[PDB]
Amino acid sequence: MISGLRTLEQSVGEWLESIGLQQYESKLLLNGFDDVHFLGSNVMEEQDLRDIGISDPQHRRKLLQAARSLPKVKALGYDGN
């Protein structure tokens, strides 16, 4: 999703709360993955979400979309602001 309407200051809880996965926050926190400024750095692959607990499809594809949709991402084409 090249587009997205979100806040420029959201934490793990709130972030996951916007998608309804705040319940799995504990898993994303106990795995030292709470770093919101790493969602774009860390691999954040399916296996990563599975190792923490998120082994669901609607929970893996969602966390991967909201994670990659974040700023500071490897430019692939067409620069923007």
Helix content: 40-55%
Text of the CATH class:
Mainly Alpha
Number of domains: 1
CATH superfamily: Transcription Factor, Ets-1
Percent range for β-strand residues: under 5%
- What is the chain-wise order of helices and strands? HHHH
Cα distance spanning the termini? 15 Å
**What's the count of strands?**
0
Largest sheet, described in full?
Answer: none
Describe this structure in words.
The chain has helices at residues 12-19, 25-30, 46-52, 57-68. The protein is mostly helical and 81 residues long. The protein has a single domain (11-70), classed as Transcription Factor, Ets-1 (DNA polymerase, domain 1), CATH 1.10.150. The protein is globular.
Layout of secondary structure:
Blueprint: H1 12-19, H2 25-30, H3 46-52, H4 57-68
Protein name: Ankyrin repeat and SAM domain-containing protein 1A
Function: Regulator of different signaling pathways. Regulates EPHA8 receptor tyrosine kinase signaling to control cell migration and neurite retraction.
Subunit structure: Interacts (via SAM domain) with EPHA2 (via SAM domain). Interacts with EPHA8; EPHA8 kinase activity-independent but stimulated by EPHA8 ubiquitination. Interacts (via SAM domain) with EPHA6 (via SAM domain).
